[PDB]
Design a protein around this motif. Sequence first.
Motif, PDB file in Angstrom:
ATOM      1  N   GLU A 110       0.822  -1.209   0.000  1.00 58.53           N
ATOM      2  CA  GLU A 110       0.000   0.000   0.000  1.00 58.53           C
ATOM      3  C   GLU A 110       0.857   1.260   0.000  1.00 58.53           C
ATOM      4  O   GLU A 110       0.535   2.239  -0.685  1.00 58.53           O
ATOM      5  CB  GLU A 110      -0.938  -0.015   1.209  1.00 58.53           C
ATOM      6  N   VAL A 111       1.949   1.256   0.767  1.00 58.95           N
ATOM      7  CA  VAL A 111       2.859   2.398   0.780  1.00 58.95           C
ATOM      8  C   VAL A 111       3.568   2.536  -0.564  1.00 58.95           C
ATOM      9  O   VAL A 111       3.685   3.640  -1.111  1.00 58.95           O
ATOM     10  CB  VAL A 111       3.855   2.264   1.950  1.00 58.95           C
ATOM     11  N   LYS A 112       4.017   1.416  -1.137  1.00 62.33           N
ATOM     12  CA  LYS A 112       4.856   1.469  -2.329  1.00 62.33           C
ATOM     13  C   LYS A 112       4.076   1.788  -3.598  1.00 62.33           C
ATOM     14  O   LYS A 112       4.624   2.438  -4.494  1.00 62.33           O
ATOM     15  CB  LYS A 112       5.603   0.146  -2.505  1.00 62.33           C
ATOM     16  N   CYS A 113       2.817   1.342  -3.704  1.00 62.90           N
ATOM     17  CA  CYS A 113       2.045   1.569  -4.926  1.00 62.90           C
ATOM     18  C   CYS A 113       1.807   3.055  -5.171  1.00 62.90           C
ATOM     19  O   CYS A 113       1.893   3.531  -6.315  1.00 62.90           O
ATOM     20  CB  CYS A 113       0.715   0.820  -4.847  1.00 62.90           C
ATOM     21  N   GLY A 114       1.522   3.805  -4.103  1.00 65.81           N
ATOM     22  CA  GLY A 114       1.343   5.239  -4.230  1.00 65.81           C
ATOM     23  C   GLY A 114       2.593   5.962  -4.692  1.00 65.81           C
ATOM     24  O   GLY A 114       2.500   6.999  -5.347  1.00 65.81           O
ATOM     25  N   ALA A 115       3.773   5.413  -4.381  1.00 67.01           N
ATOM     26  CA  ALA A 115       5.024   6.031  -4.813  1.00 67.01           C
ATOM     27  C   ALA A 115       5.149   6.034  -6.334  1.00 67.01           C
ATOM     28  O   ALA A 115       5.420   7.075  -6.942  1.00 67.01           O
ATOM     29  CB  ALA A 115       6.213   5.315  -4.173  1.00 67.01           C
ATOM     30  N   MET A 116       4.927   4.882  -6.972  1.00 72.41           N
ATOM     31  CA  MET A 116       4.994   4.853  -8.431  1.00 72.41           C
ATOM     32  C   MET A 116       3.784   5.521  -9.076  1.00 72.41           C
ATOM     33  O   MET A 116       3.900   6.037 -10.194  1.00 72.41           O
ATOM     34  CB  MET A 116       5.160   3.423  -8.948  1.00 72.41           C
ATOM     35  N   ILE A 117       2.631   5.549  -8.395  1.00 66.63           N
ATOM     36  CA  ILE A 117       1.491   6.306  -8.917  1.00 66.63           C
ATOM     37  C   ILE A 117       1.823   7.796  -8.976  1.00 66.63           C
ATOM     38  O   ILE A 117       1.598   8.470  -9.994  1.00 66.63           O
ATOM     39  CB  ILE A 117       0.233   6.033  -8.070  1.00 66.63           C
ATOM     40  N   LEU A 118       2.406   8.324  -7.899  1.00 63.71           N
ATOM     41  CA  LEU A 118       2.803   9.724  -7.884  1.00 63.71           C
ATOM     42  C   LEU A 118       3.987   9.990  -8.805  1.00 63.71           C
ATOM     43  O   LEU A 118       4.116  11.101  -9.317  1.00 63.71           O
ATOM     44  CB  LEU A 118       3.119  10.169  -6.456  1.00 63.71           C
ATOM     45  N   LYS A 119       4.847   8.994  -9.039  1.00 60.36           N
ATOM     46  CA  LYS A 119       5.909   9.147 -10.034  1.00 60.36           C
ATOM     47  C   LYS A 119       5.335   9.259 -11.444  1.00 60.36           C
ATOM     48  O   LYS A 119       5.820  10.053 -12.263  1.00 60.36           O
ATOM     49  CB  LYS A 119       6.884   7.974  -9.939  1.00 60.36           C
ATOM     50  N   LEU A 120       4.301   8.462 -11.738  1.00 59.74           N
ATOM     51  CA  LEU A 120       3.570   8.584 -12.998  1.00 59.74           C
ATOM     52  C   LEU A 120       2.965   9.978 -13.134  1.00 59.74           C
ATOM     53  O   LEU A 120       3.023  10.602 -14.206  1.00 59.74           O
ATOM     54  CB  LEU A 120       2.477   7.512 -13.049  1.00 59.74           C
ATOM     55  N   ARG A 121       2.399  10.485 -12.034  1.00 54.70           N
ATOM     56  CA  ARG A 121       1.844  11.836 -12.023  1.00 54.70           C
ATOM     57  C   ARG A 121       2.926  12.886 -12.262  1.00 54.70           C
ATOM     58  O   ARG A 121       2.699  13.861 -12.990  1.00 54.70           O
ATOM     59  CB  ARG A 121       1.122  12.094 -10.700  1.00 54.70           C
ATOM     60  N   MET A 122       4.107  12.706 -11.656  1.00 62.35           N
ATOM     61  CA  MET A 122       5.220  13.631 -11.871  1.00 62.35           C
ATOM     62  C   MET A 122       5.650  13.656 -13.324  1.00 62.35           C
ATOM     63  O   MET A 122       5.924  14.724 -13.879  1.00 62.35           O
ATOM     64  CB  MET A 122       6.432  13.267 -11.014  1.00 62.35           C
ATOM     65  N   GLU A 123       5.756  12.478 -13.947  1.00 63.05           N
ATOM     66  CA  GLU A 123       6.158  12.431 -15.350  1.00 63.05           C
ATOM     67  C   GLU A 123       5.135  13.120 -16.243  1.00 63.05           C
ATOM     68  O   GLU A 123       5.509  13.913 -17.118  1.00 63.05           O
ATOM     69  CB  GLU A 123       6.389  10.988 -15.796  1.00 63.05           C
ATOM     70  N   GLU A 124       3.840  12.872 -16.005  1.00 60.96           N
ATOM     71  CA  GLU A 124       2.811  13.531 -16.809  1.00 60.96           C
ATOM     72  C   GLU A 124       2.836  15.048 -16.622  1.00 60.96           C
ATOM     73  O   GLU A 124       2.813  15.802 -17.606  1.00 60.96           O
ATOM     74  CB  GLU A 124       1.429  12.977 -16.464  1.00 60.96           C
ATOM     75  N   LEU A 125       2.936  15.510 -15.371  1.00 63.63           N
ATOM     76  CA  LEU A 125       2.913  16.946 -15.102  1.00 63.63           C
ATOM     77  C   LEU A 125       4.173  17.634 -15.617  1.00 63.63           C
ATOM     78  O   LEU A 125       4.107  18.764 -16.112  1.00 63.63           O
ATOM     79  CB  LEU A 125       2.738  17.199 -13.604  1.00 63.63           C
ATOM     80  N   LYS A 126       5.327  16.967 -15.529  1.00 60.15           N
ATOM     81  CA  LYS A 126       6.570  17.573 -15.993  1.00 60.15           C
ATOM     82  C   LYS A 126       6.624  17.634 -17.515  1.00 60.15           C
ATOM     83  O   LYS A 126       7.129  18.613 -18.080  1.00 60.15           O
ATOM     84  CB  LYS A 126       7.768  16.802 -15.443  1.00 60.15           C
ATOM     85  N   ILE A 127       6.111  16.604 -18.196  1.00 56.26           N
ATOM     86  CA  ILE A 127       6.040  16.657 -19.654  1.00 56.26           C
ATOM     87  C   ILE A 127       5.057  17.737 -20.097  1.00 56.26           C
ATOM     88  O   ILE A 127       5.306  18.462 -21.068  1.00 56.26           O
ATOM     89  CB  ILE A 127       5.685  15.270 -20.223  1.00 56.26           C
ATOM     90  N   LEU A 128       3.947  17.892 -19.364  1.00 58.38           N
ATOM     91  CA  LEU A 128       3.007  18.970 -19.665  1.00 58.38           C
ATOM     92  C   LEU A 128       3.632  20.343 -19.429  1.00 58.38           C
ATOM     93  O   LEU A 128       3.359  21.292 -20.174  1.00 58.38           O
ATOM     94  CB  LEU A 128       1.742  18.807 -18.824  1.00 58.38           C
ATOM     95  N   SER A 129       4.464  20.469 -18.391  1.00 58.16           N
ATOM     96  CA  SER A 129       5.128  21.739 -18.112  1.00 58.16           C
ATOM     97  C   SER A 129       6.158  22.078 -19.183  1.00 58.16           C
ATOM     98  O   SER A 129       6.239  23.225 -19.637  1.00 58.16           O
ATOM     99  CB  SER A 129       5.786  21.695 -16.734  1.00 58.16           C
ATOM    100  N   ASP A 130       6.952  21.093 -19.600  1.00 59.41           N
ATOM    101  CA  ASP A 130       7.967  21.328 -20.616  1.00 59.41           C
ATOM    102  C   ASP A 130       7.392  21.435 -22.022  1.00 59.41           C
ATOM    103  O   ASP A 130       8.075  21.954 -22.911  1.00 59.41           O
ATOM    104  CB  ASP A 130       9.018  20.217 -20.573  1.00 59.41           C
ATOM    105  N   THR A 131       6.160  20.965 -22.242  1.00 60.50           N
ATOM    106  CA  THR A 131       5.577  21.003 -23.580  1.00 60.50           C
ATOM    107  C   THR A 131       5.251  22.429 -24.009  1.00 60.50           C
ATOM    108  O   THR A 131       5.520  22.815 -25.152  1.00 60.50           O
ATOM    109  CB  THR A 131       4.323  20.126 -23.629  1.00 60.50           C
TER     110      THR A 131
END
Lengths: 50, 53, 49
Positions: B12-33
């Motif tokens: 439960e602790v670890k799944c949220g880490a990669m979920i938020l990492k997925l969110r970071m990648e999406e938000l950072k690509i949107l920021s750099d786009t």
Amino acid sequence: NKDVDMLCDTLYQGGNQLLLSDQELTEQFHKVESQLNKLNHLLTDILADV
Amino acid sequence: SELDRINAQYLEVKCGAMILKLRMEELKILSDTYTVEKVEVHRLIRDRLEGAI
Amino acid sequence: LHMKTSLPPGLPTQELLQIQASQEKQQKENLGQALKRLEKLLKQALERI
């Protein structure tokens, strides 16, 4: 003797090896781990591409 | 039972880490786009397409 | 009298049956639904891939 018998039957649950962990819960953990590994592989591929 | 409880809490602790990492990648690509220039340029594209259509 | 006094520690086997039933069912109920919710979030991530 009956007490020993259903204690053995409850602990073994049809397997020759002892089953301390809940077996369907254990394979649930295994499939969660495997699907998490697949998602991590996809995520790391995307990280490499980025 | 405690072993399985700690195992599931770790999952439960670890799944949220990669979920938020997925969110970071999406938000950072949107920021750099879209930079500062590109946002105003795309707003002018919205204005130009509206004025033509 | 030894057979009436050398009983093994803890509640007896016929009571231990529902003891282990209750403990394993609460162990499963605390964790399996959490695993299902985790898998739902994980497959949401899979379709967002």
